Symmetry: none
Subunit: 29 residues, 3 copies
């Protein structure tokens, strides 16, 4: 038998990270 075939293709792009947290409350009025 021949040598092993070429390496497989690189996988697809990973998922986006989660949304960041809401900002802090505003300063006093």
């Amino acid at each position: 038998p021949g040598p092993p075939g070429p390496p497989g293709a690189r996988g697809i792009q990973g998922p986006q990270g989660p949304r960041g947290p809401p900002g802090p409350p505003g300063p006093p009025g």
Copy 2:
């Protein structure tokens, strides 16, 4: 024919997630 080739590498990292929304109103 020889055996199947090795698996490919993991893909590129995903993008940064979206920014959070603006925060709440401050106090009176």
Copy 3:
């Protein structure tokens, strides 16, 4: 002859969490 191409890689790592949003409006 050589064998066929290997399987595709898995999906990439998750991206980082997004940035915290801006401070809120004055009260």
